Design a protein around this nucleic acid. Structure first.
Ligand SMILES: [Mn+2]
Ligand SMILES: [Mn+2]
Ligand SMILES: [Mn+2]
Ligand SMILES: [Mn+2]
Ligand SMILES: [Mn+2]
Ligand SMILES: [Mn+2]
Ligand SMILES: [Mn+2]
Ligand SMILES: [Mn+2]
Ligand SMILES: [Mn+2]
Lengths: 84, 99, 92, 102, 106, 93, 77, 96
DNA sequence: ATCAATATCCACCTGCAGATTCTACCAAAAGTGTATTTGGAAACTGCTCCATCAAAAGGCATGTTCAGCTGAATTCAGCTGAACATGCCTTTTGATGGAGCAGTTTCCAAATACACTTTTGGTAGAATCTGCAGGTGGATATTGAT
DNA sequence: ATCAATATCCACCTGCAGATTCTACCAAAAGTGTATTTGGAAACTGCTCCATCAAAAGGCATGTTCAGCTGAATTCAGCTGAACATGCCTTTTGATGGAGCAGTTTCCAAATACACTTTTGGTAGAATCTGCAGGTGGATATTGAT
């Protein structure tokens, strides 16, 4: 019903990536980092969401809950606190 | 009367101080949400999300990427550079065991 | 009570896939460790899946979801297919 | 007729059913077919690993699979490599010299 | 004879009876849980909570605020070697500890 | 729709160590995740210890060993002392 | 005692790891890293040993300790 | 008199030890180190022999993998010589 | 960029020690038949909270100019780490006794479970409380052109 | 080694959104009585691990020689940071249906329970036959001389 979502990895803008790198202590950034970072993020996010949806489908739900995400992150060894 | 200009790197260092002091999320929220819904819908049509599920995804993604830029920076310094490059990201991910 | 091993079943599979081929004792030790490792991973995740959904029965639906969470892709789809085949042959 | 045989399996359905029953919570149950499915997964992965390692052993013209052949089989297969991170005792590593070291 | 809390009986703040029920329902097929297992567990959880809150509260007090935030939890956990290795989880909203490598300052 | 949590116990400990300090609700959510996480680690390792040793009861001894496996260095000594003190106090009635 | 881990053994491990040239300071650094790893594993292994009220460390004690440090070892039960 | 040039024999050794699977640390001094370390935790410890072997397989596998990551860090810095800073970088990225 | 010398590596060989496969016994355990209970699915329904859209404005992304200073390329010599001969010792190997303990089976007082009941600590939501988030301004430190 | 620009730091303040306290029901903790399980003492024995003893060879330690790698020094094209005009799209807060997540009730397909017969699989010794130790001789690959 909503507009079809396409190409939203580009929504992760160069300034957003620069801010993340600055919190990571980075002072200077090759022009090629932005696309590399987009690729890495997409893989990470895909993998987490794949498992979250597997939990959602196991529970016979149409709604991904925060717990589905927490469980997916735990199953990937990236435990997250604060959403239980 | 020449307009004031900071030297290259001065503002970058101030930005490091600033973002390392604060804790707010650094990716815009609605575009992150569109990304999450796009990927998820490619696994399973007509899914809904609790808003806290999206926020948990953003917190985990940003912590992951900040940690990865820390390691990447260690690799760039190891090669006597101050500039991170794709090969730094790839070395850090290789030693982390990521694909 | 008994000191259980998967050795005889691993050997029967070996004779299915490579009739002419043996296996050293140390390699069989590695296969036993592997089988126990995978079994505990699947049983663990299946148990947790039941609990998350407020259920006390581990069914093949829990086993299948755990396989999809634990195995990487092509292995997962082939494994699911093999489990499904076995269940329907069994209930026939 | 054993449950293994009914399912067309070599791995032991009854034993596995007992083990699953041992990993339940208080009041936990195990469904009629969960041991069949589990045994089938374990047999499938066992057959994939042995098929590859047996290929290695024949290629080296010895009759027995060793830890070395298991290591070559697993580490040479991206899916098995990612599934099995454990140390294969006595397996060594896969030969590889980086390009700049020649 | 009036009821005595097992928590009070143990001299603890954390809830011994509730933790005992969590242990009973997460066990084995015919698993049993001894009486003092829940006491010991509650005491461990309470102690670890005390250490995290002690350091977090010291960080909040140093920044002249009255409430602990995730920021203070993160500064406290990552600033303590043993808590840092115990707690590998992501602290949502925690940020990072300032650090700029020496080679990056001109 | 009743939901149990560790929030009031975390708060009581907070008033013990920092009498004039509060805690935001997000930080309290972090503490709740922390307590549930450590509890699952200890319970699981305790069950495994019992299984390895062919015992069907989880006792304070399995808990103590789990704590020694789980906790680094000084934290382990301090936690073990709090736990044995709580047990000996409890059994003294 | 850690000195019984000789420079040629360390070199052999590096060679299996693909290393062509080795700085002189590597051998003592490697002894340090090895010592820490062995300490952590053995501390847990012995913890399992004294839980079982035993005096002899089993291969199973070692396997459990490696497992819980995320370094699962196959082949020793 | 025949002499190989520096690096020829190192390369040969790499191919040799990557072809083989045997343990590379000698048995008795490793066993001695294990017992000494264990002394700092519980006294009169005995060891099954398979336990010492388990510990050696794990230690050697760990060190080999570490030297592969160390080699990656040396190569990243345009070196062929692994140095302590390469070990330190690999261990820090590994989370050790 | 041959072309002799020269060292090492790699199939291939046999003889046979010994490591695997075969064999058969027998507690353990799987499977069956029968009985019985029950977790959870299938409806049904309250009613949360999710999707989508609306509006408005201002925070922030975008795209551009310009030049500082970074990474890249290059050279080279000091010095370190590889190769090797040689000689010595630590480890390996092989054997022999026995102390210590781990693994086994019995037994039962202590410990834990369970149904039922009493009592209250813990929770959801409402009322109350008040940090602190943004404002504000002005002092201090840093920066960069002179 | 002076001074304008400008960021940063560091006081202050209020009111409202978020945190804390209040309130009263009630789910589950605790008390009671009784039933069932168990872990840990106690003898009990073989296995296995330690200690000790020995020869000897295989690998380590050490000292020399020098090849060539690392690190230092230099240069410069052009990439990336800083700054900023432009304007759009994110943020924030609310409306509005209604999908779908939870709460209840029932009642049966699916699960456990138990007694008993069949069947399996771990074990240890026999029988079988692989793969290892060294040996060769040829393939390959390095090194010096051009
Ligand atoms: Mn799509
Ligand atoms: Mn009845
Ligand atoms: Mn029911
Ligand atoms: Mn020279
Ligand atoms: Mn009350
Ligand atoms: Mn403020
Ligand atoms: Mn049989
Ligand atoms: Mn040979
Ligand atoms: Mn000859």
């Amino acid at each position: 019903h909503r507009k079809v979502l396409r190409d939203n990895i580009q929504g992760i803008t160069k300034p957003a990536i620069r801010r993340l790198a600055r919190r990571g202590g980075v002072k200077r950034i090759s022009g090629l980092i932005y696309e590399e970072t987009r690729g890495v993020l997409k893989v990470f996010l895909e993998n987490v969401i794949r498992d979250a949806v597997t939990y959602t489908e196991h529970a016979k739900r149409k709604t991904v809950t925060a717990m589905d995400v927490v469980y997916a992150l735990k199953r990937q060894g990236r435990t997250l606190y604060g959403f239980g | 009367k020449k307009p004031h200009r900071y030297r290259p790197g001065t503002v970058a260092l101030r930005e490091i101080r600033r973002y390392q002091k604060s804790t707010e999320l650094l990716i815009r929220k609605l575009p992150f949400q569109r990304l999450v819904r796009e990927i998820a819908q490619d696994f399973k049509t007509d899914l809904r999300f609790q808003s806290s599920a999206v926020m948990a995804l953003q917190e985990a993604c940003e912590a992951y990427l900040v940690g990865l830029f820390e390691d990447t920076n260690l690799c760039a310094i190891h090669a006597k550079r101050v500039t991170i490059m794709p090969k730094d990201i790839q070395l850090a991910r290789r030693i982390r065991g990521e694909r | 009570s008994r000191k259980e091993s998967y050795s005889i079943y691993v050997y029967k599979v070996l004779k299915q896939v490579h009739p002419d081929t043996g296996i050293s004792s140390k390699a069989m030790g590695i296969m036993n460790s592997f089988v126990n490792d995978i079994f505990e991973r699947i049983a663990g995740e299946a148990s947790r899946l039941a609990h998350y959904n407020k259920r006390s029965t581990i069914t093949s639906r829990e086993i299948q979801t755990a396989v999809r969470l634990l195995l990487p892709g092509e292995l997962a789809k082939h494994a699911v297919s093999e489990g499904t085949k076995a269940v329907t042959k069994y209930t026939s | 007729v054993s449950r293994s045989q009914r399912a067309g399996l070599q791995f032991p359905v009854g034993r596995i059913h007992r083990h699953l029953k041992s990993r339940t919570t208080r009041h936990g149950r195990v469904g009629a077919t969960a041991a069949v499915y589990s045994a089938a997964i374990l047999e499938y992965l066992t057959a994939e690993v042995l098929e590859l390692a047996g290929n290695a052993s024949k290629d080296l013209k010895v009759k027995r699979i060793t830890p070395r052949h298991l290591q070559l089989a697993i580490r040479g297969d991206e899916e098995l490599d990612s599934l099995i991170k454990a140390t294969i005792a006595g397996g060594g590593v896969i030969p590889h010299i980086h390009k700049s070291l020649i």
